[PDB]
Amino acid sequence: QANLMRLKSDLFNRSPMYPGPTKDDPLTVTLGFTLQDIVKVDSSTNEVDLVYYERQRWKLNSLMWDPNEYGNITDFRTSAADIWTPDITAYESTRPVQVLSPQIAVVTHDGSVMFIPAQRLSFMCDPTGVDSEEGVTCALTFGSWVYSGFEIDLKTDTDQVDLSSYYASSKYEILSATQTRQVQHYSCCPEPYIDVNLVVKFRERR
Amino acid sequence: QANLMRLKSDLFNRSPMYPGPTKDDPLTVTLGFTLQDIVKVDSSTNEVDLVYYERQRWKLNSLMWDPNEYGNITDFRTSAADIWTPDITAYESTRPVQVLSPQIAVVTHDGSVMFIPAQRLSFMCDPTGVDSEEGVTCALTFGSWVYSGFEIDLKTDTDQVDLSSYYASSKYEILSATQTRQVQHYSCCPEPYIDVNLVVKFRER
Amino acid sequence: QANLMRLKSDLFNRSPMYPGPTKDDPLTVTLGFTLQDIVKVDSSTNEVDLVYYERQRWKLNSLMWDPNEYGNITDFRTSAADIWTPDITAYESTRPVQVLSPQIAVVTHDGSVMFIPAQRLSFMCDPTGVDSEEGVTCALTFGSWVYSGFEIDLKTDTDQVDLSSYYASSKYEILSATQTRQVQHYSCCPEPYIDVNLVVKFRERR
Amino acid sequence: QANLMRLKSDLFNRSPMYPGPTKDDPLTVTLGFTLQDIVKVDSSTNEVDLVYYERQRWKLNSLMWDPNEYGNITDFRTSAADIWTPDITAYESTRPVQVLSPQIAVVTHDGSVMFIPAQRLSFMCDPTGVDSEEGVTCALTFGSWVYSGFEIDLKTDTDQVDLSSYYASSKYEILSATQTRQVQHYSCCPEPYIDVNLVVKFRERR
Amino acid sequence: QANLMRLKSDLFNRSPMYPGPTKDDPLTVTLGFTLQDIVKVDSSTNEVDLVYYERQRWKLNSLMWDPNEYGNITDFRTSAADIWTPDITAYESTRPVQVLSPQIAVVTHDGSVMFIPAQRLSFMCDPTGVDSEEGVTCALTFGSWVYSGFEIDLKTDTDQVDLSSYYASSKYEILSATQTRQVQHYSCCPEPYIDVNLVVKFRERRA
Ligand SMILES: c1cnc2cc3c(cc2n1)[C@@H]1CNC[C@H]3C1
Ligand SMILES: c1cnc2cc3c(cc2n1)[C@@H]1CNC[C@H]3C1
Ligand SMILES: c1cnc2cc3c(cc2n1)[C@@H]1CNC[C@H]3C1
Numbered sequence A, C, D: 001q002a003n004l005m006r007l008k009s010d011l012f013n014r015s016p017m018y019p020g021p022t023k024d025d026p027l028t029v030t031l032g033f034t035l036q037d038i039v040k041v042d043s044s045t046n047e048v049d050l051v052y053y054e055r056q057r058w059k060l061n062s063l064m065w066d067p068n069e070y071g072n073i074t075d076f077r078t079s080a081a082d083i084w085t086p087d088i089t090a091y092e093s094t095r096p097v098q099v100l101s102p103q104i105a106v107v108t109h110d111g112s113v114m115f116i117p118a119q120r121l122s123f124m125c126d127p128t129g130v131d132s133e134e135g136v137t138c139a140l141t142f143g144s145w146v147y148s149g150f151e152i153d154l155k156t157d158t159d160q161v162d163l164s165s166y167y168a169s170s171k172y173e174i175l176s177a178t179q180t181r182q183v184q185h186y187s188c189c190p191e192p193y194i195d196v197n198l199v200v201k202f203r204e205r206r
Numbered sequence B: 001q002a003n004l005m006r007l008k009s010d011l012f013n014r015s016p017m018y019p020g021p022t023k024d025d026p027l028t029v030t031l032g033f034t035l036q037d038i039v040k041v042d043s044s045t046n047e048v049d050l051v052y053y054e055r056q057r058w059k060l061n062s063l064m065w066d067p068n069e070y071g072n073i074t075d076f077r078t079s080a081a082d083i084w085t086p087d088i089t090a091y092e093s094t095r096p097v098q099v100l101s102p103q104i105a106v107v108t109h110d111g112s113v114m115f116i117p118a119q120r121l122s123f124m125c126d127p128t129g130v131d132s133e134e135g136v137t138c139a140l141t142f143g144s145w146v147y148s149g150f151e152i153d154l155k156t157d158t159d160q161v162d163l164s165s166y167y168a169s170s171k172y173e174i175l176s177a178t179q180t181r182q183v184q185h186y187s188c189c190p191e192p193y194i195d196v197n198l199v200v201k202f203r204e205r
Numbered sequence E: 001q002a003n004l005m006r007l008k009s010d011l012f013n014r015s016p017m018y019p020g021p022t023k024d025d026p027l028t029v030t031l032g033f034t035l036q037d038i039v040k041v042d043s044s045t046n047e048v049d050l051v052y053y054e055r056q057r058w059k060l061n062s063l064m065w066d067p068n069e070y071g072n073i074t075d076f077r078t079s080a081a082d083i084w085t086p087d088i089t090a091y092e093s094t095r096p097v098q099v100l101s102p103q104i105a106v107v108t109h110d111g112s113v114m115f116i117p118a119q120r121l122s123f124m125c126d127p128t129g130v131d132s133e134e135g136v137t138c139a140l141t142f143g144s145w146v147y148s149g150f151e152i153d154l155k156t157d158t159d160q161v162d163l164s165s166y167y168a169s170s171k172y173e174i175l176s177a178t179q180t181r182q183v184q185h186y187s188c189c190p191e192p193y194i195d196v197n198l199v200v201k202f203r204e205r206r207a
């Protein structure tokens, strides 16, 4: 309708796009994972394929507006390509990530954004021991590729990976799955980088 | 011709595109499935591959015209990218859905739209017992990814999946195939989301 | 060359693109198949891979010109994106079609266009009996996805499939291959649709 | 720098792109192949995978300039997308060709263009006898997909395929390889088409 | 915010893009490799699959600015598509490289650029002996596709490849990996071309 088209026109045409966070104006992204399925294990290459959602939230003043000035609209859907999004990357991936869902974000009048893409990922993981009762553990680090912790900071809402949607007939059952903020330095660069470490222990279902 | 060229110009360059449904102007999408073939079963990863087509219908006021003002044209075909389409998604997919058909829709003068994409889909399914005679049952949910039931509702015209085009020499025969609207809640959000549950019982032929 | 640049400019830059055929302005589209190779047969999924050319022909008034007014130019080549092309689709495909040739068409001064995309296609076919001498038969139906026979008058030139390019050393030899216009109705719509039925009889070469 | 940006501007922004050759203005394209590696052989489907360079050369008056008018610049590199390039295609491919190199041409002040993409090609080939000492022979025809002998002629600079940088540690070694111009009819068209026939004889290296 | 938006505007939208290096204005690109994983070895086709990232650095006069003129901005992240990048290519690749990371570069006020794409590469390599103690050695050649040494020169900051991030549970363990500038001629062309030669020695992880 008219107001929403007016609102989206204002936010996206009145101004050039948000150029990303800076040291002067850093951003915090809240990251949470929903694990759908461990689809595949490959012991000839030590790769494991994972289907999951990645819940992302951040807030920008450039996406703020007054609902009264727009027929009481307090939020809207929009293509993730219309707006800036964080370069959150899985560091142990072995193939380009595969997108499983539409890429549409919800923007709220207070400038907050929620974006939840579903993905399939192959990543480095030695599955040796997956057929035992103890199972095997693998770890994933999700973080910004190019922004240090002075520009993008990460946090979680919970330490528990959401398993409420996990496929009950998966070849693999999950014994535990956690998500933990952590920080490290890389050789190339002087500043610390922030990541959320996904640690998943699993085994062959029986 | 010039009447159609004028009408399309008067609809797509006339106004900004439809920004999608809202709670004040919700949209009901009608869905129907035609199952072409169960192509492949993988008992090592619990994936099944389906080829099907999905009939989508919906109606937008912004796509309306008086035919009399355009040489009596009552409907036209156009690229799906020229118009807004619903984000209907298979929730259990394990690979990006592969489109097999041109992405073209028909728009009628009353604003109604019909879009029928053919697709190959890999989804989550334990096919254990497909080699028996009782067969195996798998379930598939299709729904808007980002719109709740206050924004997009869904409907089916029939509970029967259309099987009149099913491959007679498929490696798998279909014992039953239903499509049912249902309401679900998800951990991230408090609102109800609507899906259409595709339940397919099948076995080796 | 200046004449051709000027010609393309007048045909494409001036008026908008042809919006496709309609009930008020039906269009004849001619189809012929040149079968190149049956690459692969999979009896675990009943899928067959075929490599072929699809010769497409049609004619538009909006693409006509008088050669006299353009240095006696009688034809040119142009990107398929510059013009309308028919949505011809293989109905029994199981994977997206893989394009093997450049997407370029030839336009002649009388307005006729020829577009010949080479393609690799996987489709449903039960190859039980391919190893015998009576061989196996498979049917494949090509047609517009969205245009009925009120809009597209689909036809072949000949009923014989062009086999003069078929790979002599293929794993599979062709016993017979026909191409025939047929009229079908579909559940969704009341209009009759036109397709070309491709029937191919083939066996393992020996 | 200044003079080069000015030259590229004057070439690409003043007049539009070369629209391709015609009957009355044909273009001769020179072609050489450099074989890098026969990567793979598939005897269940009669497909062979090849990695090669394709050296293309042609000349356009519309790409000529006076170097003295442009700071003694005699040539320059530019994205292949900024200029017209010929639609050379392998007729016997079974999968879309994969590009392995940047796609950048060199344009020289006399209007001559050199373009050398590296590619991987799956094509129709019977490897029956690849493990013998006499090896097996296969052939590949390369030509414009849509320009006939009236619009594009092809020539080779030599009859011999460049094998000087072939990969010494390939599963397959090359006994001989030739490239030869030939003229051919196709069922669709009365105009003959020119191709270059690549004939390669190889065997498994031991 | 506003200054950053204004700065990017002046660099990209006002001046036409850099047309690349020439003999008159040659360019030096510094390259360094960080090897994450040897995923796969195919002895039926002599291909090896490798996951690595590649650190690239160069400097352009045309990317310089005075920070006091732009709210003290000394650097910024920008899409790799917004700027010129070197056409560094693995010569031995057998598949198109698969990009694993966002394609975002960092540009600094002195005109220097840093770009670190992560990639999966399939390349030609005979892995015979990979299941032995002594292992197998393979060589990769990275260089410009179309610029000779008169237009693009290369260097490493060190001769030792970075192995400290190598996945410890790979199927394959690395014995050594070096990265060395080298000069070559090619049949088609009269000018020397520069590359960094990456030599990796590895074997199957056992015991
Ligand atoms: C700027 C541009 N790209 C970078 C890539 C990486 C890093 C910093 C970068 N800074 C370290 C952290 N993230 C991945 C690699 C290495
Ligand atoms: C806004 C944006 N993305 C969403 C993704 C999902 C959901 C709601 C969203 N709302 C729940 C339902 N649909 C899929 C997942 C979870
Ligand atoms: C408009 C848009 N899409 C359609 C898809 C199909 C059909 C008609 C359509 N009309 C029937 C015929 N062609 C393929 C399927 C079903």
Ligand SMILES: c1cnc2cc3c(cc2n1)[C@@H]1CNC[C@H]3C1
Residues within 6 Å of the ligand: C104, C105, C106, C114, C115, C116, D144, D145, D146, D147, D186, D188, D189, D193
């Ligand atoms: C116009 C457009 N496409 C064509 C494709 C081919 C041919 C002519 C064409 N002319 C014959 C020669 N080139 C490949 C096939 C057949």
Ligand SMILES: c1cnc2cc3c(cc2n1)[C@@H]1CNC[C@H]3C1
Residues within 6 Å of the ligand: D104, D105, D106, D114, D115, D116, E144, E145, E146, E147, E186, E188, E189, E193
């Ligand atoms: C200009 C344009 N393309 C080239 C391609 C190559 C070469 C030089 C080129 N110069 C030699 C070096 N790079 C790869 C091949 C061969």
